[model samples]
Target: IPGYDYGRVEKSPITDLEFDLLKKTVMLGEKDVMYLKKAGDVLKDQVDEILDLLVGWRASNEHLIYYFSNPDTGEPIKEYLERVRARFGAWILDTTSRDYNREWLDYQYEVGLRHHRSKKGVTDGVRTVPHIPLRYLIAQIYPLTATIKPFLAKKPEDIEGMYNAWFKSVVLQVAIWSHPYTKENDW
Candidate 1:
């Protein structure tokens, strides 16, 4: 925590490319996270729109949504969708704030792994999301990038810049999460 003064992040267990991402993230600062954080409050209104898009995507891509089932509760798909919507709404608010901390960063990496399969609860329970496909994960970037623009600012360049920042953040997290998919990486 003392290192926050100089923006020094802990040594991540991610691969070389991810190591470079974490380095780039150090310079990202609260300004970057806050840009999204600041908009998170009002972003709630758009949550339904965003979730609908996600649900529609899954509906059309059953092969992808097949993994969305709960390993524990056996809840309905809509239930899972609703929970994700709610959780993501909250996450958006935290993603750039305390979430940028060293501890939070560690949790995020764990989330990436657990997302590859369904599992337990606690610590970072929601991380145990469905075994979502990589293509869908990659698909999210575009809609999220596009859907969020309206909330960024009215100006074109500002919207575009904000999208780039947001996209980079997602990309970094994705790379870190890919640890579990790789042979050499582990928690």
Candidate 2:
């Protein structure tokens, strides 16, 4: 349970009216009002963009299946095609978002190092990817989350398989991306 914790604090249940009063009291300050407004706006934009991209990808997949399938003999499974496309799109987005988040987190880690180096009064070449080298430290010191254990079991060789699949898919898609085909062009 190193990576997880269960609080043993006694819970005090409150009625709906009491909870509403507490919520109103908490939001009485101008600072709280501004914070909530800003957070809501930012979250709304992020959610809108994510949903739009997912929906557009699904729609594109639908069109591809409809156009490619032979109307006379070939059966077009719209639901199946949509599901597969959505899954692929979602996985791609998940990986890309994780990579971006990691980069940002790593940058913050470097900033902390800068502060530490300043305090130590020593300026030398700083190391990057320290986490990569010290990854064993994490596994050794902290217990893996329960949810992650099941996922890790399924993709025990995830690191290798992920990169291999990504590279192969990218190479295959590059041709399609650069192909001299357009909406007006007949295949």
Candidate 3:
């Protein structure tokens, strides 16, 4: 679990007050939390299928694939990819089920750090790439959010609420994840 340390890591740079403000900014309230939990339940058993879609999508894009490959040789690092794959699936589960408590907030920041230069290679110990550029991270919100709609549709009755909740959470998370990349007082 080199890069999968969710809790028991450093304190999140964003404080509880800050996180609350972020949630407020995104309008993620109690109702959204309820929907997020419902979505989590709906998606619990479909983790592998969702992973398949994501992997397939990423595989088709060379730029996306490059992050998991050795920069010098352009060779894909199998272990690095596999290790992240496992954790990525876990992240979906956590996102829906976990409360937005201190630990969760800290882990969210950890996730941000992992993608930024401050901690990018520290997790997997692979010299694949220095950082995953912020542009791509922001750009990915669409595909990641849009692709999951079909899966959420499995429980059609709750689709709209769940989808909206998921969208807000993803945007909220990417904002936190971009913490390291932001200049002081600019975040």
Best by lDDT: 3
The lDDT for every candidate, in the order shown, is 0.52, 0.29, 0.82
lDDT of 1 by residue, 77-116 (tens): 5545555545555455445334455555665655564465
* Clash totals, every prediction: 0, 0, 0
Tens-digit lDDT track for model 3 on 26-131? 8999988998999899898998788876653343434687887788998778777777877888888888888988888888888888888888767888888888
Q: Model 1 reaches what TM-score against the true structure? A: 0.62
Candidate 2, 55-90: lDDT as tens digits = 333343223243223345455444433443443334
| Lowest lDDT block of 10, candidate 3 | 53-62
lDDT of 2 at 102: 30
- The better-scoring model by lDDT among 1 and 2 is 1
Error of 3 at 96 (Å): 0.5
- Lowest-sum lDDT 10-residue window in model 1: 1-10
The parts of candidate 2 lying over 4 Å away from their true place are 1-58, 61-63, 66-72, 98-169, 172-187
Off by over 4 Å in 1: 1-31, 41-45, 55-63, 69-76, 96-99, 118-130, 153-155, 185-187
lDDT of 1 at 117: 53
